[PDB]
Design a protein around this ligand. Structure first.
Ligand SMILES: C=C(C)CCOP(=O)(O)OP(=O)(O)O
Ligand SMILES: [Cl-]
Lengths: 283, 283
């Protein structure tokens, strides 16, 4: 009954946004290893008690509003993105405290190449750096993290940092984070169709035996479960090609606040709302 | 691009004092062809929304029929009976507003999980509705056709729609995708299968499959992207509807139950759409 209890009062907190990048606190040693308890929120709030059967198994988040948050303050959009890093880690910590098993984060879409070259170059380098900067912490929290996305145009440096993070965390099981970079739902489905086509060309698949499960089995990360709860910040109400196959049956909750203002309490509030609702027939 | 407001003398719809709802006889157009649709009972006129802010394609999940009836001490089938006039009313309103494409979720692949008594009713009802209404739909310049999956669907339903399709194939006021036994994943799977057969026959190189290849092999490849995705009853799910096509759609979730719905609600949803900013990855 799956939440971590309220942390010890003196347990380290996160995030302190008075420095950039944010300092992830040193955590107390654990007597016999295993994953470390994540730092509690600055507010010292505790995760709501929700039965495991009523939790969303898989939460997907479109982390929207970074640039707007910056423009609103008369700053360059890339400054908003910088604040979003601490929020990603805060949300990871809060997902663990709540007992969420799967988290997918929309870091960069196949359509975001439409943004300015300066912004694209920044996001590519930033995602590379964030992964290197945070994967040791993620590992110690028992996070299993890996890349989900498409190869063309994506900086090899980003793929490489996530590949190391993936190898480092492949045996972890507290939570899995799908770090989606150069991700597009239609493209991922297209890539599965291509893999299916190759299998058929090789004679290893009869076209007449292709089902929905065949597609699922040939997606890039076939272990990703259906999305239960699809969250988006900034007041936008669209899925924007995120987890397209996997979120076919997801419930959507749209939260108005901008990603840099978001925190784990906001994740919990959406999960509570999801959990509280009478589950309708056929769901 | 709206029709100008109808004269106060022009016939109205729906008149719910009998069942099924009788569609009124209309006067003749100026040389031309399609009849001007009957105005709403309230005689309300469509809002003036410019072409560049209007949705080209609206998708509607018609939800809440059964709960409407339950609420009133009525068998669920009575709610479906009341929703039938609402479909026509929304068709009339779509034409008034200038919507070019309308997709309606008449029956999902998940709906096989309902009671056999309800499934048998819904099959026979859709059969009869298409038969009863296609002549009117033709006169209004509606191009209507079936979108969906063949296995399990009653042959009579497919046939009535095939007849409606042939009768209205040269109409161009509005296109209605009447989606029966439809599932987004299933539709994509069916495309993948078509592609797999071509690969098996030596006619397609797997390495040449692109997103466009999938689009070209969907059942109805002419259906454009969904701009506005609407669902009634307050439920915030796409439920596998127009899955490929709605990847970048705007979502509007309205609380109204479908038998209570009318064209003014469609227009209100379109006004909300008209001042949302779409980015498609940009900015
Ligand atoms: C996590 C975010 C917000 C980046 C995804 O951009 P999108 O392409 O998915 O979003 P829109 O352009 O439709 O606003
Ligand atoms: Cl329940």
């Amino acid at each position: 009954f799956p939440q971590l209890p309220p942390a010890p009062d003196d347990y380290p907190t996160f995030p302190d946004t008075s420095t950039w990048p944010v300092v992830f606190p040193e955590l107390p040693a654990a007597p016999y290893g295993g994953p470390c308890r994540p730092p509690q929120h600055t507010s010292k709030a505790a995760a709501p008690r929700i039965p495991a059967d009523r939790l969303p198994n898989h939460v997907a988040i479109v982390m929207d509003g970074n640039g707007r948050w910056a423009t609103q303050r008369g700053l360059a959009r890339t400054e908003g993105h910088k604040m979003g890093e601490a929020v990603v880690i805060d949300i990871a910590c809060g997902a663990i405290e709540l007992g969420i098993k799967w988290l997918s984060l929309y870091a960069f879409s196949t359509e975001n190449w439409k943004r300015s070259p300066e912004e694209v170059r920044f996001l590519m380098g930033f995602n590379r750096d964030v992964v290197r900067r945070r994967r040791d912490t993620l590992k110690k929290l028992g996070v299993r993290i890996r890349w989900v996305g498409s190869r063309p145009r994506l900086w090899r440096s980003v793929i490489n940092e996530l590949a190391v993070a993936e190898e480092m965390t492949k045996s972890n099981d507290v939570i899995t984070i799908n770090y989606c970079v150069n991700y597009g739902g239609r493209t991922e489905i297209t890539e599965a169709t291509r893999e299916i086509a190759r299998e058929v060309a090789a004679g290893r698949l009869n076209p007449e035996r292709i089902t929905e499960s065949t597609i699922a089995r040939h997606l890039q990360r076939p272990d990703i479960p259906d999305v239960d709860l699809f969250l988006r910040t900034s007041g936008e109400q669209r899925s924007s090609n995120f987890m397209l196959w996997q979120a076919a049956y997801a419930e959507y909750i749209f939260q108005d606040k901008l990603w840099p203002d978001y925190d784990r309490r906001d994740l919990w509030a959406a999960c509570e709302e999801y959990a509280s609702r009478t589950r309708r027939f056929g769901s």
